[PDB]
Amino acid sequence: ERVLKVFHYFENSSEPTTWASIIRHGDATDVRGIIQKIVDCHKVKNVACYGLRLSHLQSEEVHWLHLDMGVSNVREKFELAHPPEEWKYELRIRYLPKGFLNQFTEDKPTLNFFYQQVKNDYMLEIADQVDQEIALKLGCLEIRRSYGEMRGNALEKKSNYEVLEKDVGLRRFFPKSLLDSVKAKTLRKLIQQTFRQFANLNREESILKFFEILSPVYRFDKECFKCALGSSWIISVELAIGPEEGISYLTDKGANPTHLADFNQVQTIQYSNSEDKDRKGMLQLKIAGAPEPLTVTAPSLTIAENMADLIDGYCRLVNGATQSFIIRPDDYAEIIDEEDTYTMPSTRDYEIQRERIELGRCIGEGQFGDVHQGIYMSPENPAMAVAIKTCKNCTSDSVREKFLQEALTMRQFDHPHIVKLIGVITENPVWIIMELCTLGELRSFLQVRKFSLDLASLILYAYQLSTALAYLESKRFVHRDIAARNVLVSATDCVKLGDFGLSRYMEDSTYYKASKGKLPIKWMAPESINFRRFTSASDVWMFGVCMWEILMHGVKPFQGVKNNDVIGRIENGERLPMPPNCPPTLYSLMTKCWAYDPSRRPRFTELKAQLSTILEEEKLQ
Amino acid sequence: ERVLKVFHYFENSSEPTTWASIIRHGDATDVRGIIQKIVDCHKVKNVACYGLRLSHLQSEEVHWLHLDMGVSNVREKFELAHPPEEWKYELRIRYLPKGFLNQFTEDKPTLNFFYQQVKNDYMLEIADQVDQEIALKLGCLEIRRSYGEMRGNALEKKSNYEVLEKDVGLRRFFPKSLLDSVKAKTLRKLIQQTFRQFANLNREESILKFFEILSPVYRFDKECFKCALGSSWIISVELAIGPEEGISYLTDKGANPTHLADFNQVQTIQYSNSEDKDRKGMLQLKIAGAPEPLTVTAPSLTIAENMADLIDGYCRLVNGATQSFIIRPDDYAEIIDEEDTYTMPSTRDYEIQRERIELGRCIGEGQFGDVHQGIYMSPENPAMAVAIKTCKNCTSDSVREKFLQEALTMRQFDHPHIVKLIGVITENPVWIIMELCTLGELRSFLQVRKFSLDLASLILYAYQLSTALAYLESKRFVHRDIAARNVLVSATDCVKLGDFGLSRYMEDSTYYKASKGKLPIKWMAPESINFRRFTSASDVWMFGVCMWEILMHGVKPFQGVKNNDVIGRIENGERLPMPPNCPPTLYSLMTKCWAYDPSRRPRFTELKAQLSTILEEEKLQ
Ligand SMILES: Nc1ncnc2c1ncn2[C@@H]1O[C@H](COP(=O)(O)OP(=O)(O)NP(=O)(O)O)[C@@H](O)[C@H]1O
Ligand SMILES: Nc1ncnc2c1ncn2[C@@H]1O[C@H](COP(=O)(O)OP(=O)(O)NP(=O)(O)O)[C@@H](O)[C@H]1O
Ligand SMILES: [Mg+2]
Ligand SMILES: [Mg+2]
């Protein structure tokens, strides 16, 4: 079963780039018939025009993908490489005839496709960057386009513009450097006066206006490349290939490019590697009636092959060709509507959208603010029960950066018992993705659920923590404050370690330092109390404090004790008494972790192996 | 990839029969090595003792499954039959030696297995049936067993028994006919005085006490069958096969059975069909030194083959055999912990558990009470965002039965746009499973989201309703009150029909009748206003009322009109004006549904085909 998801820019109802191709295809399926189907699903003229492209979520180098290069062969060639959920496929225009605005004015759906496309690259690269008035123009053009039938006096009104700026929220297409820079009534009046003049245009006309104003700030007709040109004295330039010029290239970054020939004169194409270990590609260009090749060498065979496709497809387009002028050295598909959407992988997007959220209420309180419960919406397995934490004060950037540091650290984990953060927010009050622990804190449940606990339950609590902090040691961070207050319950047979505010990555080199905060002493380990030395030693220690308190029914540690007397009685090697009904080897391992030799307190991985054995003995006997 | 889920009675921490085998096996895997692994996972003696069984969720006839009958061959033999999520596999004891209590007292984990097992069948069949004192005894024995280490003065206390009766809730193992029959302080004192005498026992002893008291109310040692015996004058009796007798059988339902021989005298076994078209099975029984067979014929070859396994396995058990005395006419497995739990199907359980729920708050108000938002927890894709509706008054059984009738009707649907109810509750305030529509009612969103709507959006609203009510007509119910108030929004590109309080199944024969309620006239269709005739006619009518109001931006129907004047102006054939910005063929189909000929108002299936075409034209142009 071969299924492919192909993003595109054919307008859909809900959010603007969730335009997702469910394509079922065969083993021999070419890109030709796939996209043929995709466009026949939208009654379009332009046929040899859309460039199919590759995309790796966690990278930036891509492949403008050939057609007869087999679909399954791509799937081979780049799942031999990396897992698919980071891979991704993208379809785009790459080609434009002479008056492309006109020969796509005849084809309105492709005009919208190119619109969405060009604007895509815009909002990627230059959205929060190019100036105020530029983006205001482009944004109110975006208004009048997306609104095919809105009035002209629509946004003249007080409350009804409050509608847009609040309920919609203009993060969709108005960018940051404006929107988080202006007063309320100010920005009201500002975009009023902007929108006053664009009251009337339709899809076609609004869109051609967009191009009219968008041409200078970026040459969307082309895509600028850098390379080096020459036969055997060679020089490293910028490069430009587009319909406005055919093929020309520069003498200054600011030069009017020096034309020499168009795509129309092309005979054939070839790409090949730079002839050394550099990750680079040659590019030679034989042309009609030319004894001469326009030789180029640029940072990649990747883009070399892609540029070969560039010339090949303008040849196809603005001649009568539809064939491969690239000199190299049965099958049916069907666009799936919904069915079961089998089968997407996991997500990794950091930026968060604010529409698909349930607003929650009090679940927990953190150092930076209240905690919340909500659900996120996506493709398969949607409306996921999820949670968020927010900061009460946004006047200090410092706590903002720590609040960020949470997620920016907590990204990279991977285990069945480390909690599922996904995303990042970037405005006040910045909030968080939380895999909600439905059960909540284990101090309160243990306190009020005395008759709802079992010997196996406490052991498996410790077992989950075992594998958890084992994985920490496999990937080197010192949590510094492990506690049931910071321990969450997912379900009756499943706990999870949280609270990574104090967690640090050791360069494996010895200790961590100290900053500020009244961390509880009774829980803390002696060497660290004395010298700010948090390592595997105190890890095993407070791990044992945790195992203890779990098995205590979680009564407060060192009951009726003073933090100064604590370390003195530790210097008297005093450890806390066994519980009632405590089994032997479990307590034995607790004592092993109670070794006043911090170096010889045993590790969690070994304790987990021991906990695994103690758990079986308990369930057995 | 072959994976199997096998329920069992080996105690786990959380709810008592969610004890789920994740078994990965091979193409040749016998039941022998599978269960060998399952028990080696629990360090058990008893080896040739557990009977593997089949189970069909929506039926009651099963198969006590043979061992060397291939696992994949079962999967064949009964997925050629029906879909798997209704199929199910079950493992049990079927065999007991002479002093089975003793030869399982040597094997405590199997003692618990048999405990859970026998109690399973108990709570299936006779839980809410056998008398007060019987179940009180059994229930406080259940207490002292599940509590391996609780005190004896534990439930002597006021608040701490309030703990059990509230937070636990005794639906787990105390049954209905008591629990919903007694006053608060009464039942407190009652089960106090019950529990006073069982203060001390352990697993082993509590469990043997359970058997001591449980033997008379049911002969768990055996399972009673009915059949007919004789060579060529034949007679239809009840039958009993167990270890307490070996093999004996009755002359009265109340007779002391007349023993003739044990399992020990058995030579060989055979089962075969009743020799006619009856769905029945023969059962012949050749015995040691016997010229005679103990011939039986009973309602099924199913149970004939199973009883062949009965005798075969007591032979195995209480002789030195481990071989198949049934006369018929490489492979490795590994118990999976969690991994990804691939791959379970859909659920259909009606009875609801009250532990895995989030308590919600006001989402909507129904005729019977407030509506709520919560999440359910299960195996794969758990913590699902779900919803419930409750009734304010529980003093009227009538509204209870209608509130039940909701679900008991709404069970059988199947479509991507009919809403996902699952379960049934059976005590005040009875609540409901709801696939939450996160967006909510479409009247309010349309009213306050005037600038957030698109032409495609309204068309696809109508399209979803198209396929929905098309499926109604394919399965024959008249909703009677279709409306956006009753229309829900799942997501921006997805609406769902709800409100099945008025919905009725036509025997296809003409009309439905009328009861009571101030249903809105403006929405209703003329013939039904006049004669209580709700059929495809009024279906198409109010379907058009719905399409209209959707396209209206949902302003109230017949603005400033009196319900009496309504039908008069209908008799003047008056229909409501086109909207602003209304497209042609969409309005045309609205008018087609506006035909004062109710017989010739076109159906939804044809409208859906037309809506599908109008939607494409809009997205195209
Ligand atoms: N994923 C979650 N699921 C459920 N509740 C959560 C979750 N995350 C945080 N909470 C709640 O918020 C409380 C504080 O979380 P925590 O991560 O310990 O915040 P903190 O700012 O580091 N507080 P502190 O323990 O003093 O360092 C927890 O005790 C929970 O009640
Ligand atoms: N599945 C659901 N998801 C979200 N909200 C719901 C859901 N079911 C019901 N509601 C809410 O409860 C309200 C009443 O639901 P409904 O099924 O129409 O009840 P009713 O008793 O039949 N009321 P009525 O329309 O007068 O016949 C709806 O308008 C919603 O606000
Ligand atoms: Mg913290
Ligand atoms: Mg109703």
GROMACS .gro file of N, CA and C in nm, chain A residues 92-177:
model
  258
   92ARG      N    1   0.469   2.266  -0.621
   92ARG     CA    2   0.477   2.408  -0.645
   92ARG      C    3   0.482   2.433  -0.795
   93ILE      N    4   0.446   2.555  -0.834
   93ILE     CA    5   0.497   2.606  -0.960
   93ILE      C    6   0.647   2.614  -0.950
   94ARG      N    7   0.712   2.590  -1.060
   94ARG     CA    8   0.848   2.633  -1.081
   94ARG      C    9   0.864   2.712  -1.210
   95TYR      N   10   0.760   2.719  -1.293
   95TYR     CA   11   0.769   2.767  -1.429
   95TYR      C   12   0.668   2.876  -1.458
   96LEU      N   13   0.707   2.966  -1.547
   96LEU     CA   14   0.632   3.086  -1.578
   96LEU      C   15   0.653   3.122  -1.724
   97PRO      N   16   0.548   3.136  -1.807
   97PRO     CA   17   0.573   3.180  -1.944
   97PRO      C   18   0.602   3.329  -1.946
   98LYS      N   19   0.611   3.386  -2.066
   98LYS     CA   20   0.653   3.524  -2.081
   98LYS      C   21   0.565   3.618  -2.000
   99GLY      N   22   0.438   3.629  -2.037
   99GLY     CA   23   0.343   3.705  -1.960
   99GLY      C   24   0.270   3.612  -1.867
  100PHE      N   25   0.345   3.551  -1.774
  100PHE     CA   26   0.289   3.450  -1.686
  100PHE      C   27   0.166   3.501  -1.612
  101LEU      N   28   0.164   3.629  -1.576
  101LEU     CA   29   0.044   3.686  -1.518
  101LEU      C   30  -0.074   3.673  -1.614
  102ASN      N   31  -0.049   3.682  -1.744
  102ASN     CA   32  -0.158   3.673  -1.842
  102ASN      C   33  -0.195   3.528  -1.873
  103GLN      N   34  -0.095   3.445  -1.902
  103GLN     CA   35  -0.124   3.304  -1.929
  103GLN      C   36  -0.161   3.227  -1.803
  104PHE      N   37  -0.163   3.292  -1.686
  104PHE     CA   38  -0.232   3.241  -1.569
  104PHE      C   39  -0.354   3.323  -1.532
  105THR      N   40  -0.371   3.440  -1.592
  105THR     CA   41  -0.499   3.508  -1.584
  105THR      C   42  -0.604   3.433  -1.664
  106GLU      N   43  -0.562   3.365  -1.770
  106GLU     CA   44  -0.654   3.274  -1.838
  106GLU      C   45  -0.688   3.154  -1.749
  107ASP      N   46  -0.603   3.121  -1.652
  107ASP     CA   47  -0.619   3.005  -1.564
  107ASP      C   48  -0.625   3.055  -1.420
  108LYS      N   49  -0.744   3.099  -1.379
  108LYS     CA   50  -0.763   3.153  -1.244
  108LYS      C   51  -0.724   3.059  -1.132
  109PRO      N   52  -0.757   2.930  -1.134
  109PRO     CA   53  -0.717   2.847  -1.020
  109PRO      C   54  -0.566   2.838  -1.006
  110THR      N   55  -0.494   2.835  -1.118
  110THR     CA   56  -0.349   2.839  -1.108
  110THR      C   57  -0.301   2.977  -1.065
  111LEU      N   58  -0.376   3.082  -1.097
  111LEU     CA   59  -0.341   3.214  -1.046
  111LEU      C   60  -0.346   3.214  -0.894
  112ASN      N   61  -0.450   3.153  -0.837
  112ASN     CA   62  -0.458   3.139  -0.692
  112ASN      C   63  -0.347   3.049  -0.640
  113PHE      N   64  -0.314   2.944  -0.714
  113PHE     CA   65  -0.209   2.851  -0.672
  113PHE      C   66  -0.076   2.923  -0.657
  114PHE      N   67  -0.037   2.993  -0.763
  114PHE     CA   68   0.082   3.076  -0.762
  114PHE      C   69   0.075   3.183  -0.656
  115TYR      N   70  -0.044   3.237  -0.631
  115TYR     CA   71  -0.059   3.338  -0.528
  115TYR      C   72  -0.018   3.282  -0.393
  116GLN      N   73  -0.087   3.176  -0.355
  116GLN     CA   74  -0.060   3.106  -0.230
  116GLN      C   75   0.086   3.068  -0.221
  117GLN      N   76   0.143   3.028  -0.334
  117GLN     CA   77   0.280   2.979  -0.339
  117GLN      C   78   0.380   3.091  -0.310
  118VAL      N   79   0.375   3.195  -0.392
  118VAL     CA   80   0.463   3.310  -0.378
  118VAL      C   81   0.451   3.367  -0.238
  119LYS      N   82   0.327   3.380  -0.192
  119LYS     CA   83   0.303   3.430  -0.058
  119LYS      C   84   0.358   3.335   0.046
  120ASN      N   85   0.358   3.205   0.017
  120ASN     CA   86   0.419   3.110   0.108
  120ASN      C   87   0.563   3.148   0.132
  121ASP      N   88   0.643   3.149   0.024
  121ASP     CA   89   0.784   3.186   0.035
  121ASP      C   90   0.802   3.322   0.101
  122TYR      N   91   0.709   3.413   0.075
  122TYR     CA   92   0.712   3.544   0.140
  122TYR      C   93   0.703   3.529   0.291
  123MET      N   94   0.597   3.466   0.337
  123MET     CA   95   0.574   3.453   0.479
  123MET      C   96   0.680   3.366   0.546
  124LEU      N   97   0.744   3.276   0.471
  124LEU     CA   98   0.864   3.210   0.523
  124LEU      C   99   0.971   3.313   0.553
  125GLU      N  100   1.016   3.383   0.449
  125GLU     CA  101   1.148   3.444   0.453
  125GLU      C  102   1.147   3.587   0.505
  126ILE      N  103   1.048   3.666   0.467
  126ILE     CA  104   1.059   3.812   0.473
  126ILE      C  105   0.939   3.873   0.545
  127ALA      N  106   0.849   3.788   0.598
  127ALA     CA  107   0.725   3.833   0.660
  127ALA      C  108   0.752   3.934   0.771
  128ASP      N  109   0.824   3.893   0.873
  128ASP     CA  110   0.852   3.980   0.987
  128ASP      C  111   0.967   4.076   0.961
  129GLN      N  112   1.014   4.087   0.836
  129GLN     CA  113   1.136   4.160   0.803
  129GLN      C  114   1.111   4.283   0.717
  130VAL      N  115   1.047   4.269   0.601
  130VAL     CA  116   1.030   4.384   0.512
  130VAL      C  117   0.934   4.482   0.580
  131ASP      N  118   0.937   4.607   0.535
  131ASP     CA  119   0.890   4.721   0.611
  131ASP      C  120   0.739   4.722   0.632
  132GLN      N  121   0.702   4.816   0.720
  132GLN     CA  122   0.565   4.838   0.763
  132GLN      C  123   0.470   4.852   0.645
  133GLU      N  124   0.490   4.956   0.565
  133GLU     CA  125   0.397   4.988   0.459
  133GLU      C  126   0.391   4.876   0.356
  134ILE      N  127   0.505   4.812   0.329
  134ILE     CA  128   0.509   4.699   0.236
  134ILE      C  129   0.411   4.593   0.281
  135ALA      N  130   0.427   4.548   0.404
  135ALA     CA  131   0.341   4.440   0.450
  135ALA      C  132   0.198   4.485   0.472
  136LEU      N  133   0.174   4.613   0.499
  136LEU     CA  134   0.037   4.659   0.513
  136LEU      C  135  -0.035   4.651   0.379
  137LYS      N  136   0.032   4.697   0.273
  137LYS     CA  137  -0.020   4.682   0.138
  137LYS      C  138  -0.052   4.536   0.110
  138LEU      N  139   0.049   4.451   0.128
  138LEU     CA  140   0.032   4.310   0.096
  138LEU      C  141  -0.077   4.247   0.180
  139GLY      N  142  -0.094   4.295   0.303
  139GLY     CA  143  -0.189   4.234   0.393
  139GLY      C  144  -0.332   4.272   0.360
  140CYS      N  145  -0.354   4.398   0.323
  140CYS     CA  146  -0.490   4.435   0.287
  140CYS      C  147  -0.525   4.381   0.148
  141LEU      N  148  -0.425   4.358   0.063
  141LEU     CA  149  -0.450   4.281  -0.058
  141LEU      C  150  -0.491   4.138  -0.024
  142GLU      N  151  -0.423   4.079   0.074
  142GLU     CA  152  -0.460   3.947   0.122
  142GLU      C  153  -0.604   3.946   0.172
  143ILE      N  154  -0.645   4.054   0.240
  143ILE     CA  155  -0.783   4.068   0.287
  143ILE      C  156  -0.872   4.054   0.166
  144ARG      N  157  -0.862   4.150   0.075
  144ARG     CA  158  -0.959   4.159  -0.033
  144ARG      C  159  -0.957   4.036  -0.123
  145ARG      N  160  -0.849   3.957  -0.121
  145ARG     CA  161  -0.849   3.834  -0.198
  145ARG      C  162  -0.924   3.725  -0.124
  146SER      N  163  -0.882   3.696  -0.001
  146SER     CA  164  -0.946   3.591   0.076
  146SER      C  165  -1.094   3.619   0.095
  147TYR      N  166  -1.130   3.747   0.100
  147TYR     CA  167  -1.269   3.791   0.100
  147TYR      C  168  -1.309   3.819  -0.043
  148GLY      N  169  -1.367   3.717  -0.107
  148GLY     CA  170  -1.413   3.733  -0.243
  148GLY      C  171  -1.539   3.816  -0.256
  149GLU      N  172  -1.617   3.822  -0.146
  149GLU     CA  173  -1.752   3.886  -0.146
  149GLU      C  174  -1.780   3.979  -0.027
  150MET      N  175  -1.679   4.016   0.054
  150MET     CA  176  -1.697   4.113   0.160
  150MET      C  177  -1.723   4.252   0.103
  151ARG      N  178  -1.788   4.335   0.184
  151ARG     CA  179  -1.816   4.473   0.146
  151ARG      C  180  -1.689   4.556   0.145
  152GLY      N  181  -1.704   4.680   0.099
  152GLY     CA  182  -1.596   4.777   0.096
  152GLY      C  183  -1.598   4.865   0.220
  153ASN      N  184  -1.717   4.888   0.274
  153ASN     CA  185  -1.732   4.954   0.403
  153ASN      C  186  -1.723   4.857   0.519
  154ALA      N  187  -1.672   4.737   0.494
  154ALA     CA  188  -1.673   4.631   0.594
  154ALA      C  189  -1.593   4.670   0.717
  155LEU      N  190  -1.463   4.692   0.699
  155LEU     CA  191  -1.374   4.722   0.810
  155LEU      C  192  -1.370   4.870   0.845
  156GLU      N  193  -1.466   4.948   0.798
  156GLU     CA  194  -1.478   5.086   0.841
  156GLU      C  195  -1.526   5.098   0.985
  157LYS      N  196  -1.576   4.989   1.044
  157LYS     CA  197  -1.655   4.996   1.165
  157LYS      C  198  -1.578   4.951   1.287
  158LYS      N  199  -1.609   5.016   1.398
  158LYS     CA  200  -1.539   5.002   1.525
  158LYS      C  201  -1.542   4.858   1.573
  159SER      N  202  -1.661   4.812   1.611
  159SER     CA  203  -1.675   4.679   1.666
  159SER      C  204  -1.639   4.573   1.564
  160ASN      N  205  -1.671   4.597   1.437
  160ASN     CA  206  -1.651   4.494   1.337
  160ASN      C  207  -1.507   4.482   1.291
  161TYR      N  208  -1.422   4.580   1.321
  161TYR     CA  209  -1.279   4.560   1.308
  161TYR      C  210  -1.220   4.501   1.434
  162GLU      N  211  -1.281   4.531   1.548
  162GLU     CA  212  -1.243   4.461   1.670
  162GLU      C  213  -1.261   4.311   1.652
  163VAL      N  214  -1.365   4.274   1.577
  163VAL     CA  215  -1.389   4.134   1.538
  163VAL      C  216  -1.262   4.075   1.478
  164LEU      N  217  -1.210   4.140   1.376
  164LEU     CA  218  -1.097   4.084   1.304
  164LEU      C  219  -0.974   4.079   1.393
  165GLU      N  220  -0.941   4.191   1.454
  165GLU     CA  221  -0.815   4.194   1.528
  165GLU      C  222  -0.816   4.103   1.650
  166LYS      N  223  -0.934   4.064   1.702
  166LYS     CA  224  -0.940   3.975   1.817
  166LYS      C  225  -0.971   3.831   1.779
  167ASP      N  226  -1.088   3.808   1.721
  167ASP     CA  227  -1.138   3.672   1.704
  167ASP      C  228  -1.059   3.598   1.598
  168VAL      N  229  -1.039   3.662   1.483
  168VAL     CA  230  -0.945   3.609   1.386
  168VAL      C  231  -0.805   3.610   1.443
  169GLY      N  232  -0.757   3.729   1.477
  169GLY     CA  233  -0.619   3.746   1.516
  169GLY      C  234  -0.537   3.748   1.389
  170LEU      N  235  -0.455   3.851   1.373
  170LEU     CA  236  -0.392   3.878   1.246
  170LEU      C  237  -0.252   3.818   1.236
  171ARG      N  238  -0.222   3.718   1.318
  171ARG     CA  239  -0.103   3.636   1.299
  171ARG      C  240  -0.110   3.555   1.171
  172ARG      N  241  -0.229   3.541   1.111
  172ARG     CA  242  -0.243   3.465   0.989
  172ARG      C  243  -0.151   3.518   0.880
  173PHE      N  244  -0.162   3.648   0.850
  173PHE     CA  245  -0.083   3.706   0.741
  173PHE      C  246  -0.028   3.845   0.768
  174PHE      N  247  -0.076   3.919   0.867
  174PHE     CA  248  -0.005   4.041   0.905
  174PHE      C  249   0.112   4.002   0.997
  175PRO      N  250   0.235   4.051   0.973
  175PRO     CA  251   0.349   4.001   1.052
  175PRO      C  252   0.383   4.074   1.182
  176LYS      N  253   0.485   4.016   1.244
  176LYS     CA  254   0.514   4.040   1.385
  176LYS      C  255   0.557   4.183   1.409
  177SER      N  256   0.660   4.227   1.337
  177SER     CA  257   0.728   4.352   1.367
  177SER      C  258   0.632   4.470   1.367
   0.00000   0.00000   0.00000
